[PDB]
Structures are given as structure tokens and as C-alpha cells.
Amino acid sequence: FKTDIEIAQEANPQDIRDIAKKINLSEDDIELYGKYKAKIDYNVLNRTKSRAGKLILTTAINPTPAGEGKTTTSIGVADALAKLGKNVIAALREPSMGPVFGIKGGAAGGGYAQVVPMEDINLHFTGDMHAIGAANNLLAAMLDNHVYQTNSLNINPKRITWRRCVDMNDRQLRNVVDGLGKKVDGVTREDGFDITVASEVMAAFCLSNNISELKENLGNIVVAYNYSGKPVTARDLNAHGAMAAILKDALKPNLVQTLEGTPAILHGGPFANIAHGCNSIIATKMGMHMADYVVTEAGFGADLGAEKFLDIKCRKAGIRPDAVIIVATVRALKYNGGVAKDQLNNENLEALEKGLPNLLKHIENITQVYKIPAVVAINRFPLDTDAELALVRSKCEELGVKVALSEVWANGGEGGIEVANEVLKLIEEGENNFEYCYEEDMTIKEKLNAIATKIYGADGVNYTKEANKQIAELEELGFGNLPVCVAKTQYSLSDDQTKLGRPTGFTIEVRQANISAGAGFVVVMTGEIMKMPGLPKLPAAERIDVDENGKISGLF
Amino acid sequence: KTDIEIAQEANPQDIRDIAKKINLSEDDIELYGKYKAKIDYNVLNRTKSRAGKLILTTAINPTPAGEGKTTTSIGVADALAKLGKNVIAALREPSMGPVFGIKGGAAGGGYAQVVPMEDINLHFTGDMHAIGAANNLLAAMLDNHVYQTNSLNINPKRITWRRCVDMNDRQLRNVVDGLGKKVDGVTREDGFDITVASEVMAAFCLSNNISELKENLGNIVVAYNYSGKPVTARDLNAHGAMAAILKDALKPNLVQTLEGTPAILHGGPFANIAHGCNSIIATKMGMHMADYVVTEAGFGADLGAEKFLDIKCRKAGIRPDAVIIVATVRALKYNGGVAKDQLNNENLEALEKGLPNLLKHIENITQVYKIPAVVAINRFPLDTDAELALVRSKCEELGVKVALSEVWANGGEGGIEVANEVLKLIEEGENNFEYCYEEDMTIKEKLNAIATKIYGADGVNYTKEANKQIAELEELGFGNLPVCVAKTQYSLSDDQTKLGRPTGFTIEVRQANISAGAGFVVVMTGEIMKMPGLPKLPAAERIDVDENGKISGLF
């Protein structure tokens, strides 16, 4: 048994200039950040011909307390396709540095399906998070400056929605009052900080097809409302040009590699509840432009990440997945059947059949609602009996979807050959009549009803009085044509985190709706959301140390 | 031509070729593009030093118009390269915040610049972001400790640590945080500084290595307990994580001048509440990789040079071999009573009235610190030969040559006269370097030595709160540390209107604070703005990006 850090330290990563050569990138097309990291110039998309690569989307069932192994499968499949002689790129998200100092930080993946360098990725990496935060906080500085100087835009201070950010888990900054002191020290008002990955800049950063669309999206950001009730934008403050300049280099995707030398692109990392939870469009487009196959993923389960990948990202990017990988484990399905977190290692065919409807619902959503070829990837554990694996296979064969066993955590690309070959079969043969869940012409409530009934399995959607008032205001201002991003719990298809398996007779309770005009969707809240996490009693930072030679210990 | 046209028309060499000039291998540097690199600080442990000489560039008290101190440092470095010397220019990295308020600007000016100018003004190599992340992590765990248990018995009204952001945001000067539910923290007053004002930056620049950085960060006093005792970052188990955040940032950044001379940019603290010099690691790396190092200190010789010598050189164990004092005829005539609009006209009477300012800085460098000095005059076209002869005559009486500098328009060729006099001062080797005070003196004795010897004051006056704060610092054991005086830079006194060389004045001290991480006591003679504000029409409104990602409007 080797830890993930031991494995990353014993692997021999190639010079990134050689990794770039695998995808036909020259020295003038990349900017080095050391010998193991590089940023890819996004202008290469204009002076090279596209390869029209295939898009493979990795999703999973609803998260369980001790699983969440979507990324290990994405990397293993990418390494597997490389073993089979394919030109493949893995497209993933960059994690937030903040949580590393609270709860222990981890690898991009795990076991022998990792991305290297592990230490840099968890920390500053190539500086993307700092640039997003600087753009977010510049807009806030220019907003408060306008109100302080003249307020010729007639901004109402009690209606300012823009919040500052920091890449730290600091509960102290959730609710603040600033602008205190002398008359030269600003205008007093209530304010607050989010974690940087929660900023709307991050969502617009990840949903821009190029630098021109980024500057336009940043300008459309609604930061406040005037006394007449009309939105005030970053463009009204003449700030989006400076924000785009701060993000000029950050928008270049970051090129790294897996343990086996497979090219990997890490770019962006928004939330999967108040945002779409996918990596940037630029990274996915660049992969499809430079490679024949692209393996990407979406956060949480297929009811949240895959739904937002298809109904938000793919719509704005003009792309369509050719195959979908649905990751699940026998332990996770038995958890949906009533087994506690301590009894999962024992064989239980009865609870496996009670939790299996969860996997079956995600299969029906991908294959019958969106009409995309799918394959179930089971991360096999040693104590998984042949009767348990045969039951999951039989119930999935009834829906026309194969079940491939995955062992990428211990064997790397060799553990994903069975999944990769089934994906290649789904791409060559098998139909793809990709359909969205809803259409843009529908109203906000019609789109919410389409998601809850088709995807979640609910009978309908209920709204609070505040929700009905906010939604109607959005319709009057012209935001009813945009997609909706539902912020609900990930542990269940419903909004109740205890309804495991496949709930039926339930309804969705909507309590808040806000506009993210930069990214181009409406955030609909079905509960309370923590946009700024807190530090525990004993933060992981207390164990982090540096020796006399500059070597970091205690990160993991 | 503007500074951008000169920087855009220049052909910068690949940074790997610049590294070869200073005997750096490929494994000794980390590339940030082909024009920037970070130097592994571990090279100082596996290679032998060249024992390079240290050249300090300072100037007279700043004037509201001319500011060519950095331009002279770069021009002289290029001049020494012309003479066949192995030279490195060591300078500071500017703050990104002000770029969005007023203009962004060149590292230098004219034909004495450092390239790439766009990256230096913006994210550069990410050092500023790392300084801010460490500052804000310590603040997060400080508030977290009080929220969880407060077993250290921290008094919230006595928390001195402030958060930071690299933006000119006046809104964050005075805040109240910890509001809301019981899970949202402990309510208290707080505030933000600009990142370069953080104490992390001063300790970052005053650490000889990564081990000293982690120890200095641990000594940072963030608050006081109810018993009046200091609470440190080490008490919070925070300095290990802070040093990790700064592991790569502590590596000096390698760039180049317009003429290919190697240049190192690292650190940039304030020159009033801090020492206003670049990092010790950068200066040590320069002396380790080159035979001559040209560095500078912010503001005039009464502030930057005093803190470079009495703080930086003390903690680093180095001593400058020569000092360059930069001045202009317009600046000296400004100290003589001429307004900002009448400076282009000849005025030999006002030139003699403002010259005592330059003469005072010469006496401080040569007679108090006993360092060879040379005056570099950035010559303007309307400077008459009679004006240049008067400045020369008054300086020859003090035993200091006057060399004319034209590096702004001609580059290294304009600084050959300055460079040759520096080498002449160096080839003698006589080192009688003395500090202004000694560590065993008390805080009040150290302030009196600075005010009388350097500033020219009769003495130092203190308010009752200043006497109370200083006495508290003495009880806690901080009286053995150097002092960093935070006063106006436009005058030798604390009154910004007393130009020239004031005589009958006294220094008024109103507050004293401890920066135990950096290792000095900050003494203010007035109010200091640690968070600047945006103007009515910020330069950010002119910044734009085209369809290919080219930035316009930065300068």
C-alpha cells in the first residue's frame, strides 16, 4: 500500500515540452511554468485545423459519504485510451487552494490514476485563482468608488449584490460592514466575502468561448440595482476591459500530465450547485481541437453535474458528448438500500436491489431524456462478490447499457481498458439523438418543472412567496430566456438529503432565485448554500511545514 | 518616444541566455515564459560566491515632479556592463493595485528600463498573491482560534493583525466582520491594507533563507491576550503553512534591462512603515552571482538609505562599498523657493538655497556612515553650465565628485561617467562603515540618534500615548530592535513644507508599533495611509483587450 503522494513522488514525469509534442503543440504555442507545467495559447485555435475530437463525459451516481471517485475514472480512461494508441486529452478542473488548509488536501484523482505535479496543483498552480479573485475584487473596488465619487448611476447601496472574494475558508468575512470611518473612507454599507471559486467571475471564466466573449460576459455581470429597479452592470462601471486584462493569461488552459504521460488540461473550477461544476469551455474546445478524444467530467451526480454540463455548457459551447461514463460502486448502491457506513463490506443482495434504482434512474436520464450512449463503470472493490456484480449487470442490461469493471485506482490505464473499449464501441456504433431537457423559449418555472419531473423524478415544483416575487422580477428584466442552475443537495435526487435510492412522491421547494448574467444562467436555490466555508477546530495548516531546503511536508 | 514604445521596440533575449551570463544552469531556474525565471535559492548552498561588491543608489528628498532614482540604478548597471563587468541590478517589484487607479508605469524610464514591462506591472511571477494569501491565512486562523476556543485568551479589541488585498480599495480600510449567526465568527472591528503594506512583506524581504522566513513569520505578533502578553503566529501554529505558501515566492525573479544586463526583481515594502528595499535574498543572490550589484532604496537618503544601512545591512551582514546620490537641478531649485512651473528658467540664487539639502545627504553618507559617495546629476537640456558648475563646486568642498548622467535618453552610455567614479571609489577598498546607533540603546535613544545625526533635529518629542506604547514595548523586550521611522519624505523634518535644510525643528512622535516578524519598531510622526484610494476616473476604465488578447491602455 502506497499513499497517493508516495506514488506521485515515485513516478517519472516527462518534460512538458514533450507532452505538448504529443498533441502537436510547438514551443511558440505554449508558455512554460517550470518544466512540468505550461499554458496553451488559445490563439492556436485560429492558426491550426481542428481534429474534431470526440467528447466523453464522465459522471456518477448521487454522491455517497466515502466514495466520490469520478476523477479517478476519468484519468484512468484517458490513460487507457493512450495505451490503445489513441490521441487523447484529459480535461479536468483545478481545485481550490482554500480547503487545503482546512481539511487535508488530496491528489487530482487517486492511486495510480493521478495528475502531476500534485503539489503545485493544490497550491498556486499557474495563478488562475489569483487572477479571478483580483478581477472580482477590482470590480468591487470600482463599484464602491463610483458610489463614493458621484453615484451618477443612482445605485442603491442596500441593493448591491456583488460580493468580494478570498481564496480562504474564512467564516469571519461572510457578513461584514465596511466603508466606516472618515468621509474619505467610503460609503458605509453591508457587504460580504465568498470563496474565490464561488465568484460569478469563475462561472463566466469557464463559459467563454474566447477572450472577446469573456470581456462581453464580464460586462454583463449585474452588480447592483438602481433606485428605479434597473440592473447596474460591470459595463456601466467601465470595468470589464480591466477585468479581462487581469484574466488574459489565466484564460490560457494549463497543460499537465497523468502518471503515464497522457496529456491533461486543468482549467477552471466553479461550484456544482450554484454553478455548472465543469471545467472551462476553452479547455474542452482546445482538447477537441488538438486531440481525437477528450475525457472530461462534471461535479456531483448525473442529476446535477451532467444536467448542467448538457443543458448549460454544451448549449453555450455548441458541442455534444458522444458517450457518457456513469461511475458507481457496489458499496454506494448498498448505501442507498439502508446499509450503514460501517456494514458496507458485507454481502447484501437485498439492499443492493433497493439502492440500484438510483443507478437505473441516471441511466434512463442519459439514454432516454438526452439520448446519449452510456456505459456503467463499476469501481470494483476486493470484497465485491460475483453475485453482486452480476445483479448490477443484469438490471442494467434491461436498459440496454453494458457494465464494465474498472480497476484504475490500483492498476492505472490497464484497469480502464474495458471501460475505454466500450466507449469506443459506443462512439463508432450506437445512435446519438442528443436532446436538451428544455428549450430557451420556456419560462423559468417551465424550465424548473422540466428538470424536476424528467431528471429528478418529482411531481412538481413549489415556490415560496419570495421566490415568486424574485422570479417575476427576473422575467420583467428579460432574464427568463436563460438556462437555470438548480442549487440543491447532491446526496439525493430530491431536495431532502435523506431520501436515498429513488424517491417518487415528492416535490421541490424553491426559496430563492438570483441572476448570474455574466455566466448566463439563473441560480435557483432549493436550500441554504455555503459560499464561504469555515475552518475546523484543528486546521490542516497546523501540520504543514517547510524544511531548510524548501521542501513541504504535511500537505497530505 | 514613450517608455512603452522603447520597451516594445526592444529585442529581449531568452531568459535562459541571460541566466548563462551569470553561470546559471537549466536546473537552477524555473521559467515563467521565455522572458522571466525564478532562481532556486538553494544555489546559494551548493555553489561558491563571487563575493560581489554592493552599490547602493539613493537620492535627495523627493520632489512632486522628477523621480529618476530607479532610472539611474538601471543606467549605471548597463554602464558597468559596457565596461566588461559582471553586474546585476537588484530592484523592487511594484504593486499591481495602483495600476488600476493612476497609470501603470515602466521599471525605470527612457532607455533605462527593465523588460517585460507589462508582466512586471501585473501578476509577474505571483509573489504578491503569495504574500497576500499568507497574510490572509494567518488572519483566518487567528479569528478561527478565537471562535473555536480562544484558549490563548486573545482580546479581540487588541488584535493588531489586518487582512490585505492588492487593490486600492478605500472601502476596506475600516470594517466590522464576524456578523450574522453564531456560526459566522466573533464580531469585531477589522481592516484591510494593501498587500505591500503587510508585515509579511517586510519579513519576506528581511529573511536570509527559507528557515529564517519561517522563524520570522512565527515571531509575528498578531494580538495581545487579556494579560497584556503578545500572541504570535507561532502560538497559532501558522508560520509553517505561511512559509509553504511562500516557498516559491522567496525565489528571486530574473529579468533583464533593455541592453541585456541581468536584473533581479524581488519584494517591495513601503519605505515609511517599512525599510523600502528589495529582498535580502535578491541582494545576496546578486552578490553571489555577480561581481557588482546595483540596488536602491525608496524615498530619499534620510529614509531609504537610513533603513537600508541600519536595518537591512545589519540583518543581512553586508555593507555597501559605494553610494550613488541622485539629484537634479530642477529639484534643488524647488528646494530654493521656485514653483513647479518656473523650474525651466535659470536661477543660480535658488540653486544655492536648495543645495544644502544635497549637502546634508552627502554629510550623512560620508561622515555618519563613512561610505564613499558620488553624486549623479540627471542632466536636463535646459540645465546651464553655470548651474552644473555650482552644484559641482559645493560638492567638491565635501570631497565628493559630481558625475553627469544621461541614461534616460542614451542608456548605458549615459552612465559611464557615473560608473567610472563608482569603480574608482571601489578600487580603494577603505571600509569604515558605521551604523547610526547600536542595538543596546533604547527606543528613545535610537530615535534621538536618527533625528539629530540624519534629520538634523534638536531632539524628539513624544505624546503621552507614544510614551505609553514605547514603555509597553520596552517591558515586553522589543527595545533591542531597530527603529523604522514613518515620517514624510518631502522634507528632512516631519513637516512637508520645510524644504531645503531645516535647522530649528523637533520631531513629534505620536504612535509606536511592533513588527516582530520583520524585526523592527515602527514609529510614526503622523498618519500613514496603508490602503490607497481610487480617483474619480480610474485608469482601469481605459484598459482594454483586443480579439487576440493584446492589452491596451495600461500606460
Residue numbers in the entry:
A (entry chain C): 3 to 558
B (entry chain A): 4 to 558
Task: Copy text verbatim from the article accompanying this structure deposition.
FtfL is a key enzyme in C1 metabolism pathway. Formyltetrahydrofolic acid is then converted through two reactions to 5,10-methylene tetrahydrofolic acid, a metabolite for biosynthesis of pyrimidines and amino acids. PaFtfL exhibits a tetramer in all three crystal structures, consistent with other reported FtfL crystal structures.
To further investigate the structural mechanism of FtfL inhibition by BBR, we determined the crystal structures of PaFtfL apo enzyme, PaFtfL complexed with its substrate ATP, as well as PaFtfL complexed with BBR at 2.0 Å, 2.3 Å, and 2.6 Å resolutions, respectively. Each protomer comprises its own solvent-exposed active site close to the protomer interface. Structural comparison reveals that PaFtfL adopts essentially the same overall fold for each of the protomers and exhibits an identical active site as in reported crystal structures of FtfL from other bacterial species, indicative its conserved catalytic mechanism.
